[PDB]
Amino acid sequence: KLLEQIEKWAAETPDQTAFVWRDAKITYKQLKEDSDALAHWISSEYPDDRSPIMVYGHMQPEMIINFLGCVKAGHAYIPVDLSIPADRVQRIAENSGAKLLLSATAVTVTDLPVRIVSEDNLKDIFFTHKGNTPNPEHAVKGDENFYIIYTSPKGVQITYNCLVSFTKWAVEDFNLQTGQVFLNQAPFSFDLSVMDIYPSLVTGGTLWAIDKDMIARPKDLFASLEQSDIQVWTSTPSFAEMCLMEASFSESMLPNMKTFLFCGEVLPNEVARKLIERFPKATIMNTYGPTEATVAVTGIHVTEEVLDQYKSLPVGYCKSDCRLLIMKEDGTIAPDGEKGEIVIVGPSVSVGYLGSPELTEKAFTMIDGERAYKTGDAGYVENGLLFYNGRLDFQIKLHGYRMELEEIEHHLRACSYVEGAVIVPIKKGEKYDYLLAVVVPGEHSFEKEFKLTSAIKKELNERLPNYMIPRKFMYQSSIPMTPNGKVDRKKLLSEVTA
């Protein structure tokens, strides 16, 4: 079914661009053909095997061809971005039980206990098996693994049913039409990319990829953006914020922008507001979910009304085929409006971590016959609406006082003269010593740094208790992002600590 709705475009709109990265692009017809040849090759080489297959690279069109080739042959694929550390890739190879690794580019990771098919060798199978097609019944189905994406060091197994459950909801609730241009910011090793990959493929859209190098060089990023004619924007809030630092990043640069889809981090009320101002015709959606629950399970249309009544934006209503549970600090459920750990239950929940029995036991459970996943996230529900408070382990306790790190960040972000901010907790060694605020200053006329600091501290005093107000402030032109596009908190902690 999933592959069928995708294949449907190879016949209806064969010459439509299915994926484009810089100068490299492939049509739906080419996607089908090479994908079919690979699948045929896989089946000929591994007749009665269904071991997961590693797919190595970055944004090359072959990444997508290889993903489909793998599933058509009944093999789940393991996306491995170039950014993943060698030691990690080696662990994945050994943990996953993979026997093969496919890459369009050169594999730089020191010898892996896997058969490597790369560069020209991959090209050879496309040529060698050109025209051939795989047995329709070999295609991954039902509860069989479709892809395995690693988090933290655990392989989250996402089944066919999991992905279909997500995709259907995404296409319908995000109001995606057909033939639209979908931005792809997230590396394939990050499940945010799934939010644009499959919805685009099933709706005959065009995936417009952006790579790590464009990001390292904004002039190229924006150049690409203007040529893209992107209509559906899928990215982390941080990525959007960085683009917002560019005055030309607006409806003028992307006049056909229609839908913004956010997930992965807190979407600031101010960021959404800036996007509405810059793109008055675009719809903004905030969504929430762990990789363990197939990309996202909640979503909400962030309107002017939502922005007016929710200083802290809610993360959304749970998809209809799943449900949420807010667990009080005890096996007990919490009354609506009360904070607890967010638990997700339903067909979106992963079947567990690959080869990690003990790890699966600790985070996954069975409730009334269905899978449930403890997120490690703190939040609450109010009449179906889910609110995110922060990561349970980011819960800082300052001298006899608890507090979500994210709540302090939320208020810091809301202060005048602040365009971006992150709190770096400085620990004495065991307990929390003090908080350090890293902010990107907005326009101001403060002639001395301490004056800006005092001003923000005064405003923050009206929002938080004195003991939650960061003692130290640091200013910089931008907040670092990890290769996935999220705030790089480790890097920040590393440099501010040094």
From Swiss-Prot:
Organism superkingdom: Bacteria
Pathway: Cell wall biogenesis; lipoteichoic acid biosynthesis
Gene Ontology biological process: lipoteichoic acid biosynthetic process
Reactions catalysed, as given in the entry: holo-[D-alanyl-carrier protein] + D-alanine + ATP = D-alanyl-[D-alanyl-carrier protein] + AMP + diphosphate
Keywords assigned by UniProt, alphabetized: ATP-binding, Cytoplasm, Ligase, Nucleotide-binding
Binding site for ATP: 151-152, 286-291, 377, 388-391, 486
Family statement: Belongs to the ATP-dependent AMP-binding enzyme family. DltA subfamily.
Protein name: D-alanine--D-alanyl carrier protein ligase
Biological source species: Bacillus cereus (strain ATCC 14579 / DSM 31 / CCUG 7414 / JCM 2152 / NBRC 15305 / NCIMB 9373 / NCTC 2599 / NRRL B-3711)
The organism's taxonomic lineage, starting at the top: Bacteria, Bacillati, Bacillota, Bacilli, Bacillales
The gene coding this protein: dltA
